[PDB]
From a paper:
[name] is an important signaling molecule involved in a myriad of signaling pathways through the binding of a diverse set of receptors. Structurally, [name] consists of one five-stranded β-sheet and one short (1.5 turn) and one long (3.5 turn) α-helix. Moreover, a single dominant collective motion in [name] was revealed that covers the motion observed in unbound [name] as well as the motion observed in the ensemble of [name] complexes (X-ray structures). This motion, termed the pincer mode, describes the transition between an open and a closed [name] substate.
For nine out of eleven [name] complexes studied previously, partners interact preferentially with either the open or the closed substate. The conformational preference of binding partners for either the open or the closed [name] substate opens the possibility for a novel computational design strategy: rather than optimizing the binding interface, the conformational preference of [name] is shifted to achieve selective binding. To test the hypothesis that the identified mutants indeed affect binding selectivity by favoring a specific substate along the pincer mode, the change in binding free energy was calculated for six complexes. Assuming that the pincer mode is indeed the factor determining binding specificity, we would expect that the binding affinity would decrease if the preferred substate of [name] in the complex and the conformational preference of the mutant were not compatible. Destabilization by depopulation of the binding-compatible conformation, on the other hand, can fully abrogate binding, and is only limited by the preference of this substate in the complex or the binding free energy. Strikingly, as can be seen in Figure 4, most of the mutations that prefer a pincer mode conformation that is incompatible with the complex formation indeed destabilize the complex substantially. NMR-based titrations are well suited to determine affinities for protein–protein interactions. Here, 15N chemical shifts for [name] and [name] mutants were monitored as a function of increasing [name] concentration. These chemical shift perturbations were then used to determine global dissociation constants. When we compared the change in affinity between the studied [name] mutants and wild-type [name] with [name], an agreement was found, demonstrating the direct validation of the novel computational method employed here by solution experiments. Using [name] as a case study, the computational protocol was complemented by experimental validation and was shown to yield selective binding by means of a conformational shift due to designed single-residue mutations.
Residue numbers in the entry:
A (entry chain A): 1 to 72
B (entry chain B): 327 to 369
Write the structure that this text describes.
């Protein structure tokens, strides 16, 4: 499925992911597309900072959901 | 006025799921307009 990741400068990144992908995996995808090291990434969705060992389905992130990326 | 001044950052915060207007304005005032800097306080 596709999801979107939006930065504070307004760049929107489109990722190909699966429901059972972890947050760790999503940060790696982000690195592959944009060059951002995973240790610098904070992913935010619905007022929560997403934790590396949880999955997208754990957070009810589904088709065409949008996450926000904030750098440390 | 902070509400006009931070209109963009307030929209960003709402899109991120932070809906507490007074809490958001206060955090942005303390960080000088920085969402990045306001985020620890809001979590």
């Amino acid at each position: 499925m596709q999801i979107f990741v939006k930065t504070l400068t307004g760049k929107t990144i489109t990722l190909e992911v699966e429901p059972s992908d972890t947050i760790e995996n999503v940060k790696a995808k982000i690195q592959d597309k944009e060059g951002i090291p995973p240790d610098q990434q904070r992913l935010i969705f619905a007022g929560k900072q997403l934790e590396d060992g949880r999955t997208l389905s754990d957070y009810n992130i589904q088709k065409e959901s949008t996450l926000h990326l904030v750098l440390r | 006025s902070p509400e006009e001044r931070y209109e963009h950052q307030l929209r960003q915060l709402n899109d991120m799921g932070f809906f507490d207007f007074d809490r958001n304005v206060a955090a942005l005032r303390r960080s000088g307009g920085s969402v990045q800097g306001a985020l620890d306080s809001l979590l």
